[PDB]
Curated annotation (Swiss-Prot), chain B:
Domain of life: Bacteria
Class in the EC hierarchy, top level: transferase
Subunit structure: Homodimer.
Natural source organism: Mycobacterium tuberculosis (strain ATCC 25618 / H37Rv)
Active site: 163
Function: Probably involved in fatty acid metabolism. Binds to fatty acyl-CoAs of varying carbon chain lengths, with the highest binding affinity for palmitoyl-CoA (C16:0). In vitro, alters the cell wall lipid profile and protects mycobacteria from acidic, oxidative and antibiotic stress. May play a significant role in host-pathogen interaction.
Entry's family note: Belongs to the CoA-transferase III family.
GO molecular function, one term: transferase activity
Protein's UniProt name: Probable fatty acyl-CoA transferase Rv3272
Amino acid sequence: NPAKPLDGFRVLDFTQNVAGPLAGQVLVDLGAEVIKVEAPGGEAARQITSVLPGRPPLATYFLPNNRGKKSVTVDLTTEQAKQQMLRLADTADVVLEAFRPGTMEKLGLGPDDLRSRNPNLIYARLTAYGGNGPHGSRPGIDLVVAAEAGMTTGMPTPEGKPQIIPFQLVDNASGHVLAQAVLAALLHRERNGVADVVQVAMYDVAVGLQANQLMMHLNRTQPSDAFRTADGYIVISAYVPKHWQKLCYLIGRPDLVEDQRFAEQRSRSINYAELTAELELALASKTATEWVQLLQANGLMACLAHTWKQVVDTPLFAENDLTLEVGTITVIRTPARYASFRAVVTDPPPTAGEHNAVFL
Amino acid sequence: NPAKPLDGFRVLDFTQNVAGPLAGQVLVDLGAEVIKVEAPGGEAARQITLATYFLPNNRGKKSVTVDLTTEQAKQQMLRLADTADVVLEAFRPGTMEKLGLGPDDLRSRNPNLIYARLTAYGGNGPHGSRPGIDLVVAAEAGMTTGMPTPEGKPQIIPFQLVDNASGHVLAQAVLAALLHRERNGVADVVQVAMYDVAVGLQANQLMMHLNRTQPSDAFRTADGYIVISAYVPKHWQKLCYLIGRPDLVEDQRFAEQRSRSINYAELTAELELALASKTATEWVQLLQANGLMACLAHTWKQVVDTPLFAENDLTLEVGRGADTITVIRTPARYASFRAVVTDPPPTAGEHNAVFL
């Protein structure tokens, strides 16, 4: 019922898989009409399912990021689709595209093709590596882009194998950055009358996520770690003088405050190895849950390293109202929250080509 | 010279550390006037060196120095907010209210003011009231799951992904709010919790517990590891011929995609047997020439020197002539204007005279 930021805006979404569609989902949550353009028979990600005992399989990649969207089914190689897409684009505020560089141009749907017809059209491109040269022309997925951008650095594994982060951080981060860039473009148009071309590379996002560590190499705080306890590990960050002193008294080790090895913070960094040893000797007297309870009650930053299975059952997780029901299946909402409207949609994903008679 | 999306907008930035200032930096790049509010001595992050935390996210901002506990600074902030379009704040829940600078305090005076709050855990109740930093929020949101360590220690990701992702999400939400105000006349309160962002980055992994593909990994070679993803039927087949193992294509253990996943341990031994005859660099060259996804697992020291890194124009220089400092630009790019700034960070309190 209440107004949403993007009411009245129409988005043509050519993207597949996760990053581009998440950006589409963010736009939907903000009130835009987002029209998926899929290959005949539907997007391939519709078929990639996970087993749910006693129930139809769950399209774990497709369903969460295409709720409340509309769908047209079209074969982009034929002349008929080209014309339908050109007519559909004349009515659009935004085009979202995530093919590898050069594709849309070969189809006759490039930024120049579409923008010559519609001077108010915002054109947004998401690629793996940028399309700025020969090395950046390649297709990629999360796992390979993450590793090529350096995200395995400094994480030792038992076998000496590079550590591969087991969630799709580059995809999901890229989705939000693209959404950000579309929003900026919409504002640019609204205020200045300029309809822009926007480009986001997953590689650039990944580099950005590691910017501080990368920076030391562009130019030729303890205790803050996980620690053994009597039972399980505890994560503690207490390196600011007030917190550090507080910590030493709380674990029953006042001697550490004035120990010349640990008294100043720089000493804590140089003698970092000795410090974790002293802390773990002291932390041995309680379980991690007990230490977490004690340290938090005294205003120190500490927590358990929860597993995914544990996270979803914590009181904090329940408190933040992070889930929605899609008719039933449970999914996670987009992170940004607003007071004057709810940035969620209850609608299910569209069936493949559901709105062909409506838009073609 | 050319118009920028946020020309004419003024932002009041109370944020510290990485997450919030990154959002401010995006706003600067998009043309906004962003005014930092710092402690009298200057933000603490100015001193944590050389300055890996402060310099990259505060270029082109202006700076005022004030002690927020005093009534004089309180009044100065209230007058300044009367002129502002956006407030960015990243203290723990309840803090700004205690200073008399909460959303109702500021929005009562300025009905067009957008108020944006970045917290660690949300502030929606008792559990989400705590302060936090990247490392602790990441572990509490589940980001150590499924990563085995030599010593059995939980694996802590050594870069600030939750901070930097949160900044972009905040920037996104501020942009949405600006459009909301522009089109619907609503000046909103915006909230982004780092925990919520962290949950979102892991959404598919979390989702399996709310309701209920090979080869794609790193592999040993003669020298170094190679990362390969070739699990799609057409790609799987190409890989087998290129590494000299046509027998693997029809091998009952590996012929179907589901089989490769079940027998991934055997698959890995067979693949590494073949990959042992060449260096990782050699395999990357060969596999890419044939349209397969493969790369080295570069270190940070290596990434910066690659031809790919150079192609994408990812760095900018801060200062003039010699002894400039190199930083990384924000990722989104635009044709009608450059989302970059040359200007250096402000000195502590540099604009005290102009704003207070």
